[PDB]
Amino acid sequence: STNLAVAGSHLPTTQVTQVDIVEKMLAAPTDSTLELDGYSLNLGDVVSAARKGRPVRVKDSDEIRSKIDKSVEFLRSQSADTRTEDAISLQKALLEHQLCGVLPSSFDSFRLGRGLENSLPLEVVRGAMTIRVNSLTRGHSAVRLVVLEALTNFLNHGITPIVPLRGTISXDLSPLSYIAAAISGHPDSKVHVVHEGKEKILYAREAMALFNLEPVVLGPKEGLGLVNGTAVSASMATLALHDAHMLSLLSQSLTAMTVEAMVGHAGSFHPFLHDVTRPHPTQIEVAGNIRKLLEGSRFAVHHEDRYPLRTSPQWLGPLVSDLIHAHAVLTIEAGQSTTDNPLIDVENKTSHHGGNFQAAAVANTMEKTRLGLAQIGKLNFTQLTEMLNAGMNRGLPSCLAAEDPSLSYHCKGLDIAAAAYTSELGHLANPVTTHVQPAEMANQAVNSLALISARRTTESNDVLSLLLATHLYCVLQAIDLRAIEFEFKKQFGPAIVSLIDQHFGSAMTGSNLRDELVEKVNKTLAKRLEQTNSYDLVPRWHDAFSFAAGTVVEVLSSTSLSLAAVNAWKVAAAESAISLTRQVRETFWSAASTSSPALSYLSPRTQILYAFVREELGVKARRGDVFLGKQEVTIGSNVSKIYEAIKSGRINNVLLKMLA
Amino acid sequence: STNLAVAGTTQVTQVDIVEKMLAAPTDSTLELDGYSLNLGDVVSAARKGRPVRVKDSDEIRSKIDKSVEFLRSQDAISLQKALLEHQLCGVLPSSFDSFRLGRGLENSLPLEVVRGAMTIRVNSLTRGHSAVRLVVLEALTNFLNHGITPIVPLRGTISXDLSPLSYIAAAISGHPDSKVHVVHEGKEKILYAREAMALFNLEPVVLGPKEGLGLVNGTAVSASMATLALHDAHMLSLLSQSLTAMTVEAMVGHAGSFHPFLHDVTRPHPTQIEVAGNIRKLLEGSRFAVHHRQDRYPLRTSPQWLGPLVSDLIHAHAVLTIEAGQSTTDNPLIDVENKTSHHGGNFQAAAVANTMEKTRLGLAQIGKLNFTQLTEMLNAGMNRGLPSCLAAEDPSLSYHCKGLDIAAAAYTSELGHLANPVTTHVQPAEMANQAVNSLALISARRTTESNDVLSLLLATHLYCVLQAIDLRAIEFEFKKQFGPAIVSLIDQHFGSAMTGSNLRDELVEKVNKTLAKRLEQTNSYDLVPRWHDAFSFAAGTVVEVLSSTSLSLAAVNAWKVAAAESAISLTRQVRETFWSAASTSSPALSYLSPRTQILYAFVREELGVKARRGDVFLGKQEVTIGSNVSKIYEAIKSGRINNVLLKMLA
Amino acid sequence: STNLAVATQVTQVDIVEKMLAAPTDSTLELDGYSLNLGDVVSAARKGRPVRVKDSDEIRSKIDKSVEFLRSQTRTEDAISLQKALLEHQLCGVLPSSFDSFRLGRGLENSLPLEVVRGAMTIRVNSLTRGHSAVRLVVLEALTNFLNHGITPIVPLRGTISXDLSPLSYIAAAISGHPDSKVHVVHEGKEKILYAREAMALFNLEPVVLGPKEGLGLVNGTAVSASMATLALHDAHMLSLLSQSLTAMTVEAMVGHAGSFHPFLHDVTRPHPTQIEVAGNIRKLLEGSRFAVHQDRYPLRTSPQWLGPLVSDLIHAHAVLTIEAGQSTTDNPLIDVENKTSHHGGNFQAAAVANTMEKTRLGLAQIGKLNFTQLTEMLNAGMNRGLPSCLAAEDPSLSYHCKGLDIAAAAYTSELGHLANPVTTHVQPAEMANQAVNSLALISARRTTESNDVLSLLLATHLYCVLQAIDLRAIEFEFKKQFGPAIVSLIDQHFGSAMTGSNLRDELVEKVNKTLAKRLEQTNSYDLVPRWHDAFSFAAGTVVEVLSSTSLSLAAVNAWKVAAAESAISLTRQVRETFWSAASTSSPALSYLSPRTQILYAFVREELGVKARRGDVFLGKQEVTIGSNVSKIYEAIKSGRINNVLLKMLA
């Protein structure tokens, strides 16, 4: 509660990092019971309850039952018969106009893989029910414990009411009214449940009778004290932030891995450039994470780069600071705030009329986050597009094609997809909150529009997941293609000297030319090879040594070698390179993923992810159909596997393990 | 082709365009000739299953062969397989263990969009510019005609639309990983392309040289979804105009706002004239709308507000018929007659992206107009005397459309944020080789979402107006009996004291103006408190006009009470006869114009959604308001309401 | 540093107080770490003298960084690169001559003078950290320009905030480039002279950039940081004015000061800034005789609507002080102590653009909140009894603020459009080397415009709330005398017939009740009709309570006329005594809170903007409403209101 790791912070501060936060959340129990006491519920708890079917229950303690009883009792003392009679009517009337959202009318509209689009996702409504119960135990609304238990029972038995997707402007009555109608056994209330194997959608009553549950009878003001609030938009916002954090960390990881695949400089993350010269807390934090992932990497340079890599800390820094600030707002909103009205000050016999149902706080976190998500997207997109450009990837094959670029364009299609996702992310990033309409006959002239904003941010998390799944896929192919490059240099460096000595030397004897010749031939070779990375193997190498031969003509200018002698060497050298490269390739494709040469150069940290995608998810480097003479499983089928691992959360632990 | 009602100026209206479109056959086969296909046809083939095939005529077959031969006379199969290899990179679901109840195929493209895509694709390849053999075109029409639809990724195209079109070209060639959707013996299933071609005795095509590039090349996927989206945008535009007409009715507004002098004569913008005309036409005969004070902007500036959106919709139609029915968006293209190949950029779908951009803004504009009409009508202080939240009984325990008012606002907010342009977010795709790309498909998808959202909003507005006109009918049925009762009770209690004087007509005149003056700002009180309030004020004016009389305060008070009790009594009875008659003999049909009556019947009869009496009053929780609005929403998304709208405006 | 008030614990008021405490006389000494946002504003806008703090540690590490460079036709090839890197950066557009300078126009394509003075200050500050390797004689060149009032004329556009271009126009100026022009005031009368000319006038010597001096000098983001600071500064003022207007509106609306009670914030929704806002407003309302110690969202949800913005601003303050006061945004950067140079990206102004994006959005929300507060107050149907358009005389010939309500709407719409993000429009700059750029200056400019559009809105609100407060004061004075007059007239007309009954008390309670009930729906009538209408209705209840008395209809009518004529008579009287008194002795002073009275006085006395009686009523056309709103606006833009605000809230 006062740990900073479980509660983010406002203002920069170097006392709490995003990983500290992500660690806490992922440490939330899934088996143990979640006990709501109205003040200690944190975001990890909400996620665990909403997505990991964790058991929840109001904390067993008299203090809680006491305040809940003293509040009910207060709004009991306020003919007395008629004002109870009209109280019930007034709730019937509230539930009546509130149950007005659209949802499918039957099952004759449910096609395969379709059907519930206009329905709020199930995890969101479970998240809402958990937050609702938590705030009701504060004794500020005057609703009986047996009602809170009606909710906890639905939660523990897997009963999730079906609520409409649109309709609230987040001052979230309608959504909550559906929840209310479900536990009260409204006749037209349908819910979702998993009955011995398969999942169905029965009426409220019909589903409780399946578990021995009794619809609960409301009572005066018990209805207004239950639908009131903003638990639905807080729930979806929590889930979205949660995923946003993961995308953020996956982005920093992807940046380090891209540094390696690019043989970039780990020097742009040196603490002098951040901790000392531009002390923005999160910039320091981001620089530190990437600097940590790079330690021990034999792929990146450490001491003797384009913006997408060089300016990454100062580019993600501001986004992370906004996410940490959002996290401090959302914990206070989802675990300590009563968003109802009126609010009862029992120990003062008073009722306060205010506006804590105005979810601008939560709408605010979703606006920033959605924009931050577009920024992460631009960054990773540009890092990827540069890595796929042969004129910039510092020597990698044309489109990361393992074999001849003539009949292989491997990632070309993904370069276009990555541009399509980024574009979409941009349009999603415009603000929602500037489109506020004068609702309810001008009584609600200002409204937060939080749930709508959360929905948009949730879609951004989705598109960013496609973009980062595509980036991870590509950066992994690249790393293998570099590993193969390094295995080829290790042997060709010498082969160049052996040939130089074999063909010449006899003519260089007594001259002091062999060192000048070995150094100049290497330089012109590397100079030309850089802008030739899109040539087929055979022509690529005959081209390189043809330019090398031009150097020989100059340094050996006073020798007695014949043009035939040089051309002979040129042919031998190219033949050599060509053969040597085809052998190292076969060696790579013969080795199993567990013994990938790439493992010999990747830092200890980034190796963890390499393995996870190559071994656990079973996505392997692609050789190329036109080479294998067979059409293997599509690129898309493989990206989709990385994508599902992101959306499923399976990747979260491997991220945390490589940054801890 | 030359008909302005089939190919998008006062020489053609949106009604004409919609009429041609809804008149497309869904039974007879559609013969693709490469220059005749219109927007109606595409929809019919995409959504209605209407059979398609390339028009057998030799002239066509000749051009197709002469194109293919031209290429033969300038490895080849290796490049095609290389092309499909990198294009099959979209995200889809791994298996069927992620398919929960009602979910599953979200990252997949809608089946109707793909069928339309194959239809435009084929039509385009019959011009003999691509050089792809007829057998291939038929591989496509077969799939269509047998209900085979390839499962393609929803995202991954910047609409320069190779990726999706590569999923279609991998399905008719039986790619090993290609999946497709098909209805087999009642139920639906998704099985590998070869597995589905077997069950229909179909042969997986073998792509020859450059046939791969000729196939997967162009903007058929975007033009397809864009066409479906425009179609649905037209309907919403006409439904909005209808809602306007009905709203003016439930408001007892002026039909004079749509007089020809205000449009055809003073501000000659074609579509403004057009919209004013449509409404003036739906209002002819109405006893609700005044013919011969003031009306607010949502109704009075309606024509000059929708006019511009309409002109852009019409203009979008001209652009999309040319793009979907008379354009080959491939590259390279072959001249054949001049044995020349050309290199251009017809795959740059900027034309379709533009229609989708302005359409989406127009949909936001419509949403704002109808939302302001609705919210005004639900506002006690502005709805000209209609009951508080459109509650049939006492407003103290019934808030009928209060929630719906908030939902209208939510839908209108959503539409605003959707209206931002998508095309200003172009990225430097493919090593800066595609520095400028259209983003047409993405734009079309956003516009499709607006249509859906505007549909929720319009289904809500319609649910409300119907309830409003029924409430107004009641009021009318009441005034018919209470006008005389007032004069009767006035002659009973008074008149004996007015005898010989000239103040009876002055009294009746001032007591009617006092009531009307008060009843208008009291439409939120419960019945008995309301009437006693109304006559207590009226009592004040009698004290004045009968000032020289010899009446006693007890006398006037006795009249006031009697009058109020008579109003409460009458009102109760009129209400009771309304709920006793079947919607078929609703008093509303005696005041509704003959055209707006059509839509009234459709909803109350065919859809079966009736006026709501209450829930506290009936002592029973009936089908939720949401259940009824959803039925309307479904009638709109299904197209069922289209003919109804056409009958009204035609 | 370590104070928060300068960087829950710290509030916006604390922050604003520190900034306004910045010395505008005392020389501001730059040491590379102490510079704060208040300091920057003082140097940039108040002409405060600047100078590098004399210190051996400061000039030591500067010298040590220059000589580390020197140690590495090669001598002049270092100066040639400098002149080349200056040749291409001097590429923005400005007027080619003073022939295009019309009256009031001329420098639109130019960067604002205060923005460029702030940039030189921030630039000098970061150079004193010995990370760039720029001789002290160069820093002194810039501080001389600052201290002698010489300000380079730089292009408004051209930077994507990686801010080379504008910065190079400054470098050319202190180096005496032949084309470089500057602005300076020469013995009264401002002029634009060539850099050289100007330096002559003050005996200044143009610097001569050595090796790496140019690269170190034009590298960085001091221009963006500068405009952003100037904008955040004004944004803090505006949000405080917003909260003051909220309290004042609560008073004009006779609202409930209960919505700002600690239990509703400090206890139930513990958001730090929400508590803070609720506190400021609660603090402004203490002692008020207008607010009550049943309220729409604009006022009731005020703390939860403003809270989140204020938290963003405070976050932006922490970011900006670190960026402008203690950040080196050059590259490369030298680590003298270790004899190294690092290649990083501290020039990527993302942190700045970030604050400008959030602020622009919050400004839009402050706007919407005050526009809704204003529009409700000008709405006769919702302003709980205030005159039609805040007209001081009959509403039939006076619409006082009907024009301002439309304008407020116009400003609010503009702010909405301005609020969209700028940073999502990044283009692949310079070949592709600058693939990601911050666009900070552009974002800061848009934010500066929002500060200006919101200043128009709040100037309009403030004016209106002040006219409403006076109008409410007169209402209270009226009720003070009218209450007794009602009862007095009741006894005079019918006590003789109430004698021996227990009717008096019920009669007085009812008449008052109906007079209030009705009078709140007629605040748009013209006095004489308004009052006869109220008592006509009252006469209706007299008929009911005194139903058993022997009163004649004439006796009751007489009463009604006498009551109406005296209400009419009283109103005119209380009005005339209001307009006769001077602003210093206004009745509003009796009811206004001791703190809000402070802003009331400032506007009515210092600015001299009095309440308006009406042109038609005074038979004369006085200065226009606009001319007065303008004085309020100029008082806001000049910062003259800042101390007034601080005085109330502190």
Coordinates of C-alpha atoms in Angstrom, one line a residue, chain A residues 9-12 39 138 140 171 230 267-268 270 272-274 276-281 283 304-308 310-311 314-316 318-319 321-322 325 328-330 332-333 336-341 343-346 352-362 364 367-368 371 374-375 378-379 382 386 392 425-426 429-431 433-438 440-448, chain C residues 4 7-8 10 33 129 131 162 221 258-259 261 263-265 267-272 274 294 296-298 300-301 304-305 308-309 311-312 314-320 322-323 326-329 331 333-337 342-352 354 357-358 361 364-365 368-369 372 376 382 415-416 419-421 423-428 430 432-438:
Chain A
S9 CA 3.9 7.2 -8.4
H10 CA 3.2 10.7 -9.7
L11 CA 6.2 12.8 -10.8
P12 CA 9.4 11.1 -12.2
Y39 CA -8.4 -0.8 1.0
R138 CA -16.4 0.2 3.0
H140 CA -20.5 3.9 2.4
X171 CA -20.6 8.8 -15.1
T230 CA -17.7 3.2 -12.1
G267 CA 27.5 2.6 -25.9
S268 CA 24.4 4.7 -26.5
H270 CA 26.1 4.2 -21.1
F272 CA 27.1 8.9 -18.6
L273 CA 24.6 9.7 -21.4
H274 CA 21.6 9.3 -19.0
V276 CA 24.8 12.1 -15.6
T277 CA 23.9 14.2 -18.6
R278 CA 20.0 14.0 -18.8
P279 CA 18.7 12.7 -15.4
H280 CA 15.1 11.9 -16.4
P281 CA 14.2 9.0 -14.0
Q283 CA 15.2 7.5 -19.2
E304 CA 36.1 1.2 -29.9
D305 CA 24.0 4.1 -35.0
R306 CA 20.6 5.5 -36.2
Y307 CA 18.0 7.2 -34.1
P308 CA 15.7 4.1 -33.8
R310 CA 20.5 5.5 -30.4
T311 CA 17.6 7.7 -29.2
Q314 CA 14.9 9.2 -24.6
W315 CA 12.0 8.1 -26.8
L316 CA 10.4 5.4 -24.5
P318 CA 8.4 9.7 -21.4
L319 CA 5.9 6.8 -22.2
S321 CA 6.8 7.7 -16.9
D322 CA 3.2 8.1 -18.0
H325 CA 1.8 7.6 -13.2
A328 CA -0.6 5.1 -9.3
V329 CA -4.0 6.5 -10.4
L330 CA -5.6 3.2 -11.1
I332 CA -6.2 4.4 -5.9
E333 CA -9.2 4.2 -8.2
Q336 CA -9.4 2.5 -2.4
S337 CA -12.1 4.6 -3.9
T338 CA -15.8 4.7 -3.4
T339 CA -17.2 5.9 -6.7
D340 CA -20.8 6.1 -5.5
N341 CA -23.3 8.8 -4.7
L343 CA -22.0 8.6 0.2
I344 CA -22.9 7.9 3.9
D345 CA -20.8 9.2 6.7
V346 CA -22.2 6.8 9.3
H352 CA -22.9 13.6 1.2
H353 CA -23.8 14.5 -2.4
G354 CA -20.8 14.8 -4.6
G355 CA -19.5 13.4 -7.9
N356 CA -17.1 10.5 -7.5
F357 CA -18.8 8.7 -10.3
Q358 CA -17.1 11.1 -12.8
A359 CA -14.4 8.7 -14.1
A360 CA -12.1 11.4 -15.6
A361 CA -9.2 10.0 -13.7
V362 CA -9.4 6.6 -15.3
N364 CA -7.2 10.2 -18.4
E367 CA -5.8 8.7 -23.2
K368 CA -2.1 8.9 -22.3
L371 CA -0.8 7.6 -27.3
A374 CA 1.4 4.6 -30.7
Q375 CA 4.8 5.9 -29.8
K378 CA 6.6 4.0 -34.3
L379 CA 9.8 3.2 -32.6
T382 CA 11.3 2.0 -37.6
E386 CA 15.7 -0.4 -41.1
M392 CA 20.9 -0.1 -44.0
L425 CA -2.1 2.7 -34.0
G426 CA -1.7 6.4 -35.0
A429 CA -4.3 7.5 -30.6
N430 CA -6.5 10.6 -31.2
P431 CA -8.3 11.6 -27.9
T433 CA -12.5 12.7 -24.3
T434 CA -12.8 15.8 -26.6
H435 CA -16.0 14.4 -28.0
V436 CA -18.2 14.8 -24.9
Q437 CA -21.9 15.3 -25.6
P438 CA -24.5 17.1 -23.4
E440 CA -29.2 13.4 -20.1
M441 CA -31.1 16.6 -20.9
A442 CA -27.9 18.6 -20.1
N443 CA -27.8 17.3 -16.5
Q444 CA -24.6 15.3 -17.5
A445 CA -23.1 18.1 -19.6
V446 CA -19.6 16.8 -18.7
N447 CA -19.0 13.0 -18.6
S448 CA -15.7 11.1 -18.7
Chain C
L4 CA 9.1 20.0 -4.8
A7 CA 10.2 20.6 -8.9
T8 CA 0.1 14.8 -1.8
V10 CA 3.3 19.6 -3.3
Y33 CA 22.0 23.0 -12.2
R129 CA 28.5 22.1 -17.5
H131 CA 30.0 18.7 -21.6
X162 CA 15.9 16.5 -33.2
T221 CA 16.7 21.5 -27.8
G258 CA -21.1 20.8 0.1
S259 CA -19.8 19.2 -3.0
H261 CA -16.5 18.7 1.5
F263 CA -15.4 13.4 3.2
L264 CA -16.2 13.4 -0.6
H265 CA -12.5 13.6 -1.5
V267 CA -11.8 10.2 2.6
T268 CA -13.8 8.5 -0.2
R269 CA -11.7 9.3 -3.4
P270 CA -8.2 10.0 -2.1
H271 CA -6.7 11.2 -5.4
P272 CA -4.0 13.8 -4.3
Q274 CA -8.7 16.0 -6.5
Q294 CA -29.3 19.4 -6.4
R296 CA -25.4 19.8 -11.9
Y297 CA -22.2 18.1 -13.0
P298 CA -20.3 21.3 -14.1
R300 CA -20.6 19.1 -8.5
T301 CA -18.1 17.0 -10.5
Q304 CA -13.0 15.0 -10.2
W305 CA -12.9 16.7 -13.6
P308 CA -6.5 14.6 -13.4
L309 CA -5.4 17.7 -15.5
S311 CA -1.8 16.1 -11.9
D312 CA -0.6 16.1 -15.5
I314 CA 2.5 19.0 -12.0
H315 CA 4.0 16.0 -13.7
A316 CA 4.9 18.3 -16.7
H317 CA 6.6 20.7 -14.2
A318 CA 8.9 18.0 -12.9
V319 CA 9.9 16.9 -16.4
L320 CA 10.4 20.5 -17.6
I322 CA 14.8 18.7 -15.2
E323 CA 15.0 19.3 -19.0
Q326 CA 19.8 20.4 -15.5
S327 CA 20.0 18.7 -18.8
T328 CA 22.7 18.6 -21.5
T329 CA 20.9 17.9 -24.8
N331 CA 25.9 15.4 -28.8
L333 CA 29.1 14.8 -25.1
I334 CA 32.6 14.7 -23.4
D335 CA 33.4 13.0 -20.2
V336 CA 36.5 15.0 -19.2
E337 CA 37.2 13.2 -16.0
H342 CA 29.9 9.5 -25.9
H343 CA 27.5 9.2 -28.8
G344 CA 23.9 9.3 -27.6
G345 CA 20.6 11.0 -28.3
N346 CA 20.0 13.6 -25.7
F347 CA 18.7 15.9 -28.5
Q348 CA 15.6 13.8 -28.9
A349 CA 13.1 16.1 -27.3
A350 CA 10.4 13.4 -26.6
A351 CA 10.2 14.4 -23.0
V352 CA 9.2 18.0 -24.0
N354 CA 5.2 14.7 -24.2
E357 CA 0.7 16.9 -25.7
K358 CA -0.8 16.3 -22.3
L361 CA -5.5 18.0 -23.9
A364 CA -9.2 21.5 -23.8
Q365 CA -10.9 19.9 -20.8
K368 CA -15.2 22.3 -21.8
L369 CA -15.7 22.5 -18.0
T372 CA -20.6 24.1 -19.5
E376 CA -25.9 26.8 -17.7
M382 CA -31.3 26.6 -15.4
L415 CA -9.7 23.9 -28.4
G416 CA -11.2 20.5 -29.2
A419 CA -6.2 18.9 -28.7
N420 CA -5.4 16.1 -31.2
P421 CA -1.8 14.8 -30.9
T423 CA 3.5 13.4 -32.3
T424 CA 1.6 10.8 -34.3
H425 CA 2.5 12.6 -37.5
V426 CA 6.3 11.8 -37.5
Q427 CA 7.8 11.6 -41.0
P428 CA 11.1 9.8 -42.0
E430 CA 16.8 13.3 -43.4
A432 CA 16.0 8.1 -43.0
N433 CA 18.6 8.8 -40.4
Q434 CA 16.1 10.8 -38.4
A435 CA 13.3 8.2 -38.6
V436 CA 11.9 9.2 -35.2
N437 CA 11.8 12.8 -34.3
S438 CA 9.9 14.6 -31.4

